[PDB]
From Swiss-Prot:
Catalytic residues, chain numbering: E35, D52
Subcellular location(s) of the protein: Secreted
PANTHER family: LYSOZYME C
Gene: LYZ
Ranges where the C-type lysozyme domain occurs: 1-129
Top EC category: hydrolase
Entry protein name: Lysozyme C
Family to which this protein belongs: Belongs to the glycosyl hydrolase 22 family.
Domain of life: Eukaryota
Tissue: In the egg white and polymorphonuclear leukocytes.
Lineage of producing organism: Eukaryota, Metazoa, Chordata, Craniata, Vertebrata
Keywords carried by this UniProt record: Allergen, Antimicrobial, Bacteriolytic enzyme, Disulfide bond, Glycosidase, Hydrolase, Secreted, Signal
Main location: secreted
Key word Cell membrane present: no
Amino acid sequence: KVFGRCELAAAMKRHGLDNYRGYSLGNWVCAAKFESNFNTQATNRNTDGSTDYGILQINSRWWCNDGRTPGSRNLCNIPCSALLSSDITASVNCAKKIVSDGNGMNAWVAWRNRCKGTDVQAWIRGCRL
């Protein structure tokens, strides 16, 4: 499914991402926008054997099991296919682990390059949450 900006913001807020670990909602919307263009079925197959799955492009070496990646850790304890549904619940739950377990939103390359230092609140301006 391809989310609308405000639609995704409302769903993320209902899943408790606003101010999660000090990151306002807009950061999460901005990251989804540049990671996947709000596409829940996005997949990026990397040359290292790993694959990035879903709206937040979670990588299979560390976070989910797809049965095909060397040195997989499966730290979210989920099959990577659960990250490919229209329901964002699994990606959100795993994204929380990632910012947690690891260290901030720098984990997402698109956030680091396209959201960091910008007015992220603009991604939720106009929306009714």
